[PDB]
Amino acid sequence: QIAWSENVETALSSMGGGGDAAPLHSVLSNVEVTLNVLADSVLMEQPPL
């Protein structure tokens, strides 16, 4: 949560110049990428913790 919050804060601060392109997409992509790994890592067998 902290990493996501800092990333979004930095991206919004950078974008503050009247919509400077869209770095937020990268952040969003990052989340999706991470999510994909989780969606791949839950199918296998894992310890309960």
mmCIF file of C-alpha atoms in Angstrom:
data_model
loop_
_atom_site.group_PDB
_atom_site.id
_atom_site.type_symbol
_atom_site.label_atom_id
_atom_site.label_comp_id
_atom_site.label_asym_id
_atom_site.label_seq_id
_atom_site.Cartn_x
_atom_site.Cartn_y
_atom_site.Cartn_z
ATOM 1 C CA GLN A 1 0.000 0.000 0.000
ATOM 2 C CA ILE A 2 2.790 2.450 0.870
ATOM 3 C CA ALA A 3 4.673 1.767 -2.362
ATOM 4 C CA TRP A 4 1.494 2.264 -4.390
ATOM 5 C CA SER A 5 0.631 5.479 -2.538
ATOM 6 C CA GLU A 6 4.098 6.961 -3.044
ATOM 7 C CA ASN A 7 4.111 5.955 -6.719
ATOM 8 C CA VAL A 8 0.709 7.555 -7.319
ATOM 9 C CA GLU A 9 1.710 10.696 -5.412
ATOM 10 C CA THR A 10 4.896 11.083 -7.462
ATOM 11 C CA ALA A 11 3.079 10.435 -10.746
ATOM 12 C CA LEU A 12 0.349 12.968 -9.940
ATOM 13 C CA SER A 13 2.938 15.545 -8.867
ATOM 14 C CA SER A 14 4.799 15.070 -12.154
ATOM 15 C CA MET A 15 1.560 15.234 -14.163
ATOM 16 C CA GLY A 16 0.635 18.514 -12.440
ATOM 17 C CA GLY A 17 1.957 20.562 -15.347
ATOM 18 C CA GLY A 18 -1.385 20.622 -17.141
ATOM 19 C CA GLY A 19 -1.548 16.925 -17.977
ATOM 20 C CA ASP A 20 2.055 16.074 -18.873
ATOM 21 C CA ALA A 21 1.402 12.927 -20.951
ATOM 22 C CA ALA A 22 0.364 10.027 -18.666
ATOM 23 C CA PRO A 23 2.968 8.283 -16.468
ATOM 24 C CA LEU A 24 0.098 6.922 -14.342
ATOM 25 C CA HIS A 25 -0.466 4.257 -17.003
ATOM 26 C CA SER A 26 2.954 2.796 -16.194
ATOM 27 C CA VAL A 27 2.007 2.651 -12.512
ATOM 28 C CA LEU A 28 -1.270 0.987 -13.454
ATOM 29 C CA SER A 29 0.615 -1.396 -15.730
ATOM 30 C CA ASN A 30 2.994 -2.145 -12.863
ATOM 31 C CA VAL A 31 0.082 -3.148 -10.643
ATOM 32 C CA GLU A 32 -1.372 -5.356 -13.362
ATOM 33 C CA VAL A 33 2.030 -6.947 -13.929
ATOM 34 C CA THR A 34 2.368 -7.684 -10.225
ATOM 35 C CA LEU A 35 -1.211 -8.944 -10.161
ATOM 36 C CA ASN A 36 -0.439 -11.315 -13.025
ATOM 37 C CA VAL A 37 2.400 -12.876 -11.035
ATOM 38 C CA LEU A 38 0.033 -13.408 -8.117
ATOM 39 C CA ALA A 39 -2.543 -14.908 -10.474
ATOM 40 C CA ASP A 40 0.209 -17.307 -11.536
ATOM 41 C CA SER A 41 1.577 -18.020 -8.050
ATOM 42 C CA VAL A 42 -1.700 -19.008 -6.362
ATOM 43 C CA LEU A 43 -2.500 -21.971 -8.638
ATOM 44 C CA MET A 44 0.509 -23.994 -7.463
ATOM 45 C CA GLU A 45 0.774 -25.629 -4.045
ATOM 46 C CA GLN A 46 1.789 -23.269 -1.240
ATOM 47 C CA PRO A 47 2.062 -23.322 2.545
ATOM 48 C CA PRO A 48 -1.086 -21.978 4.227
ATOM 49 C CA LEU A 49 0.663 -18.852 5.536
#
